[PDB]
Design a protein around this ligand. Structure first.
Ligand code: HEM
Ligand code: HEM
Ligand code: NA
Lengths: 79, 489, 337
């Protein structure tokens, strides 16, 4: 994950890649593991941590499967 | 709006200014412009500090001009400032890599200088802001807090001491420059860069000339601290960003598409009126027995050409930062050198590469779009050619590079498990220039468990060089979106 | 009569009538976002407590009425306190055990404070005691006799709530070190009520087997019996998949693990019984009072019922608006007919 600059190396099971070096062990689908990663801020460098930093990040998207398009990137698009 | 102003009108509400003049925290650390930006963002975000667009830009700029790093202090870590897609990030040892480079790049750490006391506050900030930090992988397997205090903090303080901020860049950079560089996926280029001072900033226009055409972008730029050049230029609906280092009147660095930083280019630029100097030569290789056109970018190269034994040819044109040559090598495969305007130009003769490697050989792409606010993240690959070098070799640190060769691109499932899932079928496609475009984000009800259009893929490139047995592969993880991003990952 | 208390973002607790496979009551809580985390049901199935507000608070609520009977705010102006995943109501329903990971908020810096366990009188919701506790503890669970408070950290911490001290540490970190690699344990789900057994899968490897060889990695089961006070750690299969949590049946003869697959284990043989795939990722696992139904939850917004024997899906109950359960704990409680 050293070559994957910007991705996490905390594989629980991970975000960019699994602890197995694949993507099949990541949540299926990803939006099923989304809030599990956000609410406890398990990967604060990749997913908004609602535990402290971005408490209102998921507002209006209680139904993750249907409302995922509402979740914004906290980076207003820049380098 | 000035830095002093925001410092007194906004920062002083919480940050104390000692009789010494120094500010609490503010003066206990030095970092890059991007670093100060992220810090100011957090003040606004986490601690409700109201900042107008100009004030924000003002203190960020003021902090980068007074409390930045020297260019030498960013060495080895500029890849993170440039959003360079082909990079490798790690700490000085396993311990540091594991505890500090598992969430964000270790480069975010190495690009900062602080006092032992401030490094303490920073580590306290981490456990205080992200209390679950000590429960995650690589942390719950040890006494995180105990080790943070006994080993990590003393290491940071010892390894990245405050030191002293360098003197700001004082000089006028205005004028015309000649440039040369490369844009993976498209090719080499030459061009001009002109700066016109405007207050503390510079008006900037960069023109890129590829063999298939030219294009110009225009905007504003500025120099932060000792020599960090940052600029935003446009042309039509396209916007790019320059992240350069300015030293000795020469610009060096990377620019990228403002809407997709994986797409961009590397370059160097020097005053158009400078003494004889070679910036680059494209191509830098010669196919033995075949006459080829070569573009030597630089200043005052003129047409004085002195060719070595195995290469014959002439000068077809000169001036305006580029001298076009027309050579042909007939010796044996290997490194060849010549002189132009008294300047050395290095090439490599060959008939067929001994092997090709994919760059990057390990990378990612991210699903996006599909009605969402986060666009796809592509992956650019390139097939590089090589010569086994002097040792026999087939692949050791010895070798001779031949440069990027045109190739045929394809994707496939990385393994059996991936095939069963039909990853290559849903994860996206790679075009003929080696540019991989990912699939739509969101759950795909057509896949098992309605999983995302992600996949464990393999990228295979096949360059058509005669002699012929030539192919290579790369590992591509077509993965999910990231909802948190920042100037420095 | 079995019921399920499942949190639903951003501020709800849904009681499910397992018998009619339907929602029984939806309790809405004020200042609860982004989601309640650790819910607890008092004996009788009438009153419940739930950590809410980014785990910084906890509310007492009337499950039938739906009103909030009281609240506890753990954070103060100069100190932010997180309960994270540790909150447990004593078996006699009189005292609440709340874990506290705090950080002191100074003008321009943070000062990490020692972790604590705070005891509150349930009936009055008053803070009655607070003592320093080891860090990195996820779940807090009471001994069935209410004499000890256990904390799942780098080791199974045995605390005396009366004296407010750490009396014993049951090995985890160094379990069978001459044979296995340090156990990896990721446990955040409170779901031992039905069996009185707190269990979590753990991952390790045979030290005398090449680490490149996939058969080196083993999946183990950690069981902390809250009645007998005994903790057991044993390998149950060669690790080929990962499970987020596990629940033991009331008979203590079986444990069920889940994530992307549902697998049952024979605790008497310490070996796998059967495995079936799942429609989507799940986090939580609980077992009905009669040991016949296994319930999966978390991640999304639907509780799925499975036959404990065949692991065949019996049904599914959708929370209102499919509101996600995230990694919040899902608990099963009863009410005398
Ligand atoms: C004024 C816009 C301003 C600046 C500049 C500033 C800077 C700053 C730094 C460099 C730090 C240290 C962060 C680190 O550890 O790397 C820091 C920390 C805190 N600040 Fe600040 N700060 C500015 C303004 C303000 C204002 C107006 C407040 C109070 C509302 C404030 C508060 C804090 C706090 C608290 C911290 C420590 C926690 C953290 O986020 O690091 N700052 N600040
Ligand atoms: C290893 C103990 C470690 C170090 C060292 C470290 C440093 C560090 C710096 C210098 C910053 C920038 C802060 C500033 O204002 O200048 C920073 C920021 C973030 N970090 Fe970090 N960090 C270390 C470790 C970790 C770990 C293990 C995590 C993930 C749990 C993590 C996360 C973050 C995040 C998120 C930020 C950005 C915070 C913000 O500005 O909102 N770090 N880190
Ligand atoms: Na997860």
């Amino acid at each position: 994950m050293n070559a994957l600059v910007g991705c996490t190396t905390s594989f629980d099971p991970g975000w960019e890649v699994d602890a197995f070096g694949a993507v099949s062990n990541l949540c299926q689908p990803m939006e099923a593991d989304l809030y599990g990663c956000a609410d406890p801020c398990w990967w604060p460098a990749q997913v908004a941590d609602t535990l402290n930093t971005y408490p209102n990040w998921s507002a209006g998207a209680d139904d993750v499967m249907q409302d995922w398009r509402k979740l914004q990137s906290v980076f207003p698009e820049t380098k | 709006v000035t830095g002093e102003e925001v410092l007194q009108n906004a920062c002083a509400a919480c940050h104390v200014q000692h009789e010494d003049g120094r500010w609490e925290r503010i003066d206990a650390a030095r970092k890059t412009p991007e670093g100060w930006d992220m810090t100011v963002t957090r003040m606004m975000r986490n601690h409700g500090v109201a900042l107008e667009p100009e004030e924000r830009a003002a203190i960020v700029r003021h902090l980068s001009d007074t409390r930045g790093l020297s260019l030498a202090e960013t060495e080895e870590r500029r890849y993170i400032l440039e959003r360079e897609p082909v990079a490798w990030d790690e700490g000085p040892d396993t311990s540091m890599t594991q505890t500090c480079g598992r969430c964000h790049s270790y480069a975010r750490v190495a690009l900062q200088r602080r006092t032992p006391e401030d490094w303490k506050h920073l580590v306290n900030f981490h456990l205080g802001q992200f209390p679950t930090l000590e429960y995650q992988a690589l942390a719950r397997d040890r006494d995180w807090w105990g080790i943070a205090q006994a080993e990590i903090i003393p290491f940071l303080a010892r390894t990245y001491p405050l030191g002293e901020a360098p003197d700001a860049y004082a000089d006028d950079a205005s004028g015309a420059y000649v440039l040369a560089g490369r844009q993976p996926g498209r090719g080499d280029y030459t061009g001009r860069l002109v700066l016109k001072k405007a207050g503390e900033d510079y008006e900037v226009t960069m023109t890129l000339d590829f063999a298939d055409g030219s294009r110009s972008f225009s905007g504003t730029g500025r120099i932060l601290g000792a020599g960090e050049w940052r600029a935003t230029l446009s042309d039509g609906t396209v916007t790019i960003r320059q992240i350069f280092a300015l030293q000795d009147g020469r610009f060096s660095g990377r620019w990228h598409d403002a809407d997709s930083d994986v797409i961009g280019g590397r370059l160097a630029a020097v005053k158009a009126d400078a003494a004889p100097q070679v910036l680059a030569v494209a191509p830098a290789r010669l196919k033995i027995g075949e006459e080829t056109q070569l573009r030597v970018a630089g200043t005052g190269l003129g047409s004085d050409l002195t060719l070595p034994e195995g290469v014959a040819g002439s000068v077809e044109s000169a001036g305006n930062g580029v001298t076009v040559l027309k050579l042909t090598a007939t010796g044996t495969p290997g490194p060849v050198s010549l002189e132009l305007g008294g300047q050395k130009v290095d090439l490599v003769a060959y008939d067929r590469p001994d092997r090709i490697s994919i760059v990057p050989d390990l990378t990612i792409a991210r699903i996006g779009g599909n009605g969402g606010p986060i666009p796809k993240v592509p992956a650019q690959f390139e097939a590089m050619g090589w010569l086994n070098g002097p040792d026999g070799q087939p692949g050791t640190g010895d070798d001779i590079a031949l440069g990027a060769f045109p190739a045929s691109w394809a994707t496939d499932n990385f393994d059996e498990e991936a095939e069963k899932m039909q990853d290559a079928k849903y994860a996206g496609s790679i075009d003929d220039t080696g540019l991989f475009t990912p699939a739509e984000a969101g759950p795909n009800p057509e896949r098992p468990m309605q999983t995302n259009n992600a996949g464990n893929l393999k990228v295979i490139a096949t360059v058509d060089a005669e002699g012929e047995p030539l192919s290579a592969e790369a590992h591509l993880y077509a993965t999910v979106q990231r909802f948190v991003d920042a100037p420095i990952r | 009569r079995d019921y399920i208390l499942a949190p639903a973002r951003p501020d709800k607790l849904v009681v499910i009538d397992t018998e009619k496979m339907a929602v029984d009551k939806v309790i809405t809580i004020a200042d609860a976002g982004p989601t309640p985390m650790v819910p607890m049901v008092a004996p009788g199935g009438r009153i419940a407590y739930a950590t809410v507000n980014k785990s910084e608070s906890l509310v007492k609520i009337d499950l039938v009425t739906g009103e909030t009977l009281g609240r506890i705010d753990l954070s103060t102006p100069e100190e932010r306190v997180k309960s994270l995943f540790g909150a447990a109501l004593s078996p006699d329903g009189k005292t609440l055990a709340i874990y506290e990971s705090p950080v002191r908020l100074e003008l321009t810096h943070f000062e990490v404070q020692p972790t604590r366990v705070a005891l509150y009188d349930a009936e009055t919701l008053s803070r009655r005691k607070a003592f320093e506790a080891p860090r990195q503890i996820t779940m807090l669970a009471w001994a069935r006799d209410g004499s000890k408070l256990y904390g799942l950290g780098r080791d199974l911490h045995v605390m005396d709530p009366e004296a407010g001290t750490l009396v014993e540490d049951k090995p985890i970190q160094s379990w069978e070190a001459e044979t296995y690699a340090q156990p990896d344990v990721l446990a955040v789900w409170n779901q031992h009520e039905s069996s009185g057994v707190m269990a979590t899968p753990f991952y390790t490897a045979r030290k005398d087997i090449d680490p490149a060889d996939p058969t080196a990695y083993r999946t183990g089961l950690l069981t902390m019996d809250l009645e007998t006070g005994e903790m057991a750690m044993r390998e149950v299969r060669i690790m080929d998949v990962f499970y987020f949590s596990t629940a033991v049946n009331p008979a203590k003869t079986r444990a069920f693990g889940a994530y992307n697959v549902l697998e049952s284990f024979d605790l008497e043989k310490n070996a796998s019984i059967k495995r079936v795939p799942l429609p989507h990722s799940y986090y939580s696992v609980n077992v009905s009072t009669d040991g016949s139904t296994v319930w999966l939850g978390g991640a999304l917004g639907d509780l799925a019922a499975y036959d404990a024997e065949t692991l065949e899906k019996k049904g599914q109950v959708d929370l209102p608006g499919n509101a996600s359960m995230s990694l919040a704990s899902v608990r099963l409680f009863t009410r005398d007919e």
